[PDB]
Amino acid sequence: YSYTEKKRIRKDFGKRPQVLDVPYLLSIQLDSFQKFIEQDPEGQYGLEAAFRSVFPIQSYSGNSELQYVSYRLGEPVFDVQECQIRGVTYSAPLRVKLRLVIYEREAPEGTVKDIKEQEVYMGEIPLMTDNGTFVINGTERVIVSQLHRSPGVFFDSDKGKTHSSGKVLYNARIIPYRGSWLDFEFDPKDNLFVRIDRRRKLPATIILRALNYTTEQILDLFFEKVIFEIRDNKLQMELVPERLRGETASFDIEANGKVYVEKGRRITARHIRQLEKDDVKLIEVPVEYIAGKVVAKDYIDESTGELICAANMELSLDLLAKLSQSGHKRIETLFTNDLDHGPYISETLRVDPTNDRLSALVEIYRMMRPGEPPTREAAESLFENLFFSEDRYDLSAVGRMKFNRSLLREEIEGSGILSKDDIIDVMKKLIDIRNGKGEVDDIDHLGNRRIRSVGEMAENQFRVGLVRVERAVKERLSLGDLDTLMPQDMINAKPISAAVKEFFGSSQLSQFMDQNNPLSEITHKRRISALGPGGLTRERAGFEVRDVHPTHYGRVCPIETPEGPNIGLINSLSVYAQTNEYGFLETPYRKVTDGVVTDEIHYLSAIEEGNYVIAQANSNLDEEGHFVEDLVTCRSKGESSLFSRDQVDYMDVSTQQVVSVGASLIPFLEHDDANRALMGANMQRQAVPTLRADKPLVGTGMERAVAVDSGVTAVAKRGGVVQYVDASRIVIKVNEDEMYPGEAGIDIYNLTKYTRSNQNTCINQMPCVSLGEPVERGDVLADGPSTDLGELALGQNMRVAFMPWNGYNFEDSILVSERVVQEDRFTTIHIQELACVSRDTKLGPEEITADIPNVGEAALSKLDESGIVYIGAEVTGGDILVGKVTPKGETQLTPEEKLLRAIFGEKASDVKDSSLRVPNGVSGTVIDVQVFTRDGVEKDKRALEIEEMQLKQAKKDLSEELQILEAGLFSRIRAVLVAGGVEAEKLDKLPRDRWLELGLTDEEKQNQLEQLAEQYDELKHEFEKKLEAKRRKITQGDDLAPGVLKIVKVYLAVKRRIQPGDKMAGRHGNKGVISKINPIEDMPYDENGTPVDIVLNPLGVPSRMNIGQILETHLGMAAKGIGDKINAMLKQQQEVAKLREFIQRAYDLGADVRQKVDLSTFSDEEVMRLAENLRKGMPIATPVFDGAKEAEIKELLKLGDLPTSGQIRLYDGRTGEQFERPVTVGYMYMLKLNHLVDDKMHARSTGSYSLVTQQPLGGKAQFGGQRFGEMEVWALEAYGAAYTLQEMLTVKSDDVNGRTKMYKNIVDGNHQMEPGMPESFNVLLKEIRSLGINIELEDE
Amino acid sequence: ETINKLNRISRQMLQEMGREPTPEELAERMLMPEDKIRKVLKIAKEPISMET
């Protein structure tokens, strides 16, 4: 077992033993970027390879070359945490050694001077956190792995809809990793066409001519030969018996004094066998048989010296008699069949406008760049630069591989550019497909689908940077002088900087990590997308690619995918899934040799898995693991059916290996329909953390692996005892077996405290260990938000009853008692970050000064001398968090205000109040205040206060570290001295610092003493720097935007319990909205008088089929039962015996479940604590498909003295009388979505408007009016409410006079409207009349 | 022209200075009051397309 597994244990039902445990869930994200940035000895993908691609860069013929030596990543400017505060990017400097060589003109190549410039900084690049996240501006962000069509050759069909004929079509497409696409396609006339990209269509052969192929050669490529012999007189023919197949005899087939075939007699296998064994190498044919046959090569008269017939031309009884008299004996003709071997290329030539290489190149250049005059150098350079350029083209490794593999080649690796043989082979294959041999692959198949990740894309971006800078290098090297410049003046910063900064900054893939929740983060980091650059779009792709493919098994989750605009264009990574070496997806399997199912794991990709017969995770094997039944359910090639006892090569690794980490957290999933299951696994990521993280009452067993593998918790790096435990920090003393010889050391984990998340929720760690407690290597030291003892708790369980309660639960709406809002269990904490901008206008600078025109003493009280709110001061909507004032000259009043100001003696201030007020309606406590001052502007009072405070706090925080670490080290030295030098009492007497001056007998112990000291001083000096830098980074003015003099960031912590209108659901996809909060008095109770927490609606259950939501209720009930029993025995303090007995009983449950429980545990100090944590309930694990069973749940119920029915009599808290029939009651885990009404509720009367078109628009976060759409208009039309409509689209919105002229009448008590004309139509009048169109309003 | 003159010295100090010369350390290299940087660097930048 383990350590923190002593504090609690989940009861694990199910039979199937885990053959392979769950790996690191964050695997992909980390591994990828781990490959991107790294020093790679070779051209394997990485910054190295990216460099080696475009480099070296030489001037155009100028013999001045710039090559690349090596690169390095300097230490980050700010650490992960500091950078999260300041708001900069967590990034490392890119320092690269470049070399500029100037070749002495007139080769041999040797250089006059090569200046090797030291590392030149181009840009900084983002870094990945241990949690697989990036921080762009003070915010954790994630780059979603992309899934797209892998580079290579692709043979499609496109039948049906095309041309309505039904003759179908066949198209091939060569798609590289970069560069133009090469398409080959047929048409109804069987003419082979080719196009680059999506461009103009061209007859296929025209590419071959550009490759230097004459007609003769093309015909030599795509057609066999039929040899004719004019021997004696009157032509004969060579014959291979297989040729005659698929045809009926055109004449008398006879030779060798024996007539094999007659006319009108089709040639079957019989005639073929006869002619075959008889060995007929020659047959005489009529002079008329060549009337249709097409000549292969050219032909000329030796005498006349004229062209008799061009290559690829139909022979006639005329031309034949023309070339036969010339002496020609042999004539070559294409071997053509309209069934077996199709004459497509021959007919392609007849559509070919071109003749030679040049003409082809011209017709191509006038295709790619149509309309501009074609040139030789142009048409050459283009065609060479398209598919043959090492620069502008590549398939990469995946591309070359899939290419050769789909061409049935041998070599899995080769060049990134096409070869003549490549293109020609692809054409040959397309032809073969049209001929009836060979199949067509499909895009949806996961074997044709690749998966990128952060690293690849980052590499692509940095690459684009390198090319856009390459142009600059070659540009400057044009006119450059000798030693005057260096590889600095050329290479800029921005080209790399903004290039990578763009990607991480704005991309549909790059996005703010969704952090409300551990499962949210972890399921965001494992996510795939067919969208973004390189992929398709929502409107682009249809349902096909969206749909779950059979290949998605063990790779993609069939359930958890977003439901909406993009469905199936995202999905999620399966639990055990891995990115293939090439970047396909591969899944764990169990190799079955002979008749035994072996526990040896194997990784098969989408293509690898294809022919193999795979058994099922749900199957029965006993002892040595032989399949019980002689017939076992298995899926083999694309399909699934019953297979013979031993026909199988493989079996499923686990029960959960089909689903995803999110879908694996749904208990009794096998009992839920896939729709509502999707809804559930989608909503579970929307769970907001709670104030008291509880625990799942009904589990799976992934709840540990999730919270653990995610960064929310803090795991121990090494095992040992805890020296110190604080809500702030945790200090572990490292065990000797683990700990390194030098420096000794004790692991110090600094815990994260209350701080803002990306979702404006609260993220706060808490210590789960006590002072001086033993820990295991890799154990949970401190939990996170919504995490309990290593297990993931996304919400809180509670007492649930199914019964209609006076309609208050009517729809999916939920009715909850007051016991829940009282205990503050469902309460959540929110952290809002508000900012105040001090800018500069031509009218004057803005002041943050506390001196504000027109404010009360109650407003001025909450602020200090500097105008900043005190830390810890609780505020509500309208309070002044930060004072601000902006200069406004010449108030420019009217006589009424002139008289008013004259009488009341009020000087109109030259300044307007710009202060940042608390958003209306929200109320919280100020936790933290930050001040960013422009470099060079004098720091204000509060600024200095904050600065010095941070200085002292940093001094204490670093000093404490130095102290703990040093005491720990000296202790280790003192430990070494007593071995070989021993004086125990006599040692610690003299000053500690003196201990260093001591020696010891000759031994390795004298060396360790050297080490301890050698490292001591390191930590001694490493203090200085760690202080100095830390000091300076507090002092330096943070860089700001143009015009902003300083910025005050205030952090507010609001606490919201729960109220009607909030949305909360279960993991089964049953939504709900709290309707009323009912008194405990009116709450239905049982015979024990215990009120029920929540009353749901039983009507929602049958229609939306999730029966799991009931099972979770039943089991949970029984589960809590086992809690109460223990809670009794603990309250009655029986003994360590009875408790052990009952606990052992509960951990067994009938027969045949893998458990492995106690009596190893210490009889008192251990067991008694386990029961102590179990008194709240008995946590139960129900694996996805391996989960619990009816009778098991019922038996556990019997163990809890609860009924089998799971239904207990209830009583109305009002009349007290019984409810007829029982009601299902129990415990259901309920989350709380972040959809709380406090955010959702909006309203407006008359707000600010828009400048362009006068329309309602929120300026102050005072929400602009609701949108009235065309349909919403049709409603009013149908009703026939005319004035409602008019005012709706005129006076309440678009009418610039109407709005105010209305408002006046509104206050005056007169309800009317003087509508006028909406500004939209007026604007349209001006817009139309701006053109040559005269549009007027007429009549009267 | 006077703007370009700043765009010049901005580059020499780019990677040489680590990140880049501070907003107030340019015009020292120029001959002028050193305040011009703010105003000039402000009014210069072309307006963003209202249709962005």
UniProtKB/Swiss-Prot annotation, chain B:
Subunit structure of this chain's protein: Interacts transiently with the RNA polymerase catalytic core formed by RpoA, RpoB, RpoC and RpoZ (2 alpha, 1 beta, 1 beta' and 1 omega subunit) to form the RNA polymerase holoenzyme that can initiate transcription. Identified in a complex containing RpoD, the RNA polymerase subunits RpoA, RpoB and RpoZ, CRP and DNA. Interacts with Rsd; this prevents interaction with the RNA polymerase catalytic core and with promoter DNA, and as a consequence, promotes transcription from promoters that require alternative sigma factors.
Domain of life: Bacteria
Residues of the full protein shown: 458 to 509 of 613
Name assigned to this protein: RNA polymerase sigma factor RpoD
Cellular localisation: Cytoplasm
Family that this chain belongs to: Belongs to the sigma-70 factor family. RpoD/SigA subfamily.
Region (Sigma-70 factor domain-3): 1-52
Primary role: Sigma factors are initiation factors that promote the attachment of RNA polymerase to specific initiation sites and are then released. This sigma factor is the primary sigma factor during exponential growth. Preferentially transcribes genes associated with fast growth, such as ribosomal operons, other protein-synthesis related genes, rRNA- and tRNA-encoding genes and prfB.
Comment, domains: Contains 4 domains, connected by flexible linkers. In the active conformation, the domains are in an extended conformation, each making extensive interactions with the RNA polymerase catalytic core.
